[PDB]
């Protein structure tokens, strides 16, 4: 049963494990009908998380964007109007840290072509 305030909770609980990301990402696709609200609160809780978890949020994005595609172009569509902000935001606050994992996520994105060429760019130059 979808509820915005439950998502905020799951997000708060999201760990870095392969299991945490992969079954939270399943919950979200179950509710692909709620893609717009889901992404908008992800964007809010993302910006609230500490820097060590910001990456993990982008890895949630990944697993839902990629697996939602067998189901429809909802989250794919919802996330683009956001990702140029989320990346550019996480680029900073990686002030005293490493942007190599973000530059790889863009590369496994143009490789699998999850988004399109001009948008993988702007994602690259957002940082």
């Amino acid at each position: 049963s979808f509820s915005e305030s439950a998502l905020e909770k799951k997000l708060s609980e999201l760990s870095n494990s392969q299991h945490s990301v992969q079954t939270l990402s399943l919950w979200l696709i179950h509710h692909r009908k709620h893609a717009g609200p889901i992404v908008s609160v992800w964007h809010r809780e993302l910006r609230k998380a500490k820097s060590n978890r910001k990456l993990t949020f982008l890895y949630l994005a990944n697993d839902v964007i990629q697996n939602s595609k067998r189901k429809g172009p909802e989250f794919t569509r919802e996330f683009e109007s956001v990702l140029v902000d989320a990346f550019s935001h996480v680029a900073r606050e990686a002030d005293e840290g490493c942007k190599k994992p973000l530059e790889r996520l863009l590369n496994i994105w143009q490789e699998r072509s999850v988004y399109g060429g001009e948008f993988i760019q702007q994602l690259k130059l957002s940082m």
């Binding site: 494990s17 392969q18 890895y59 990629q66």
Partner: peptide
């Protein structure tokens, strides 16, 4: 502790 998420794990 479980294995760490890998961005590639999704099926392509």
């Amino acid at each position: 502790t479980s294995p760490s998420y890998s961005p590639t794990s999704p099926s392509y």
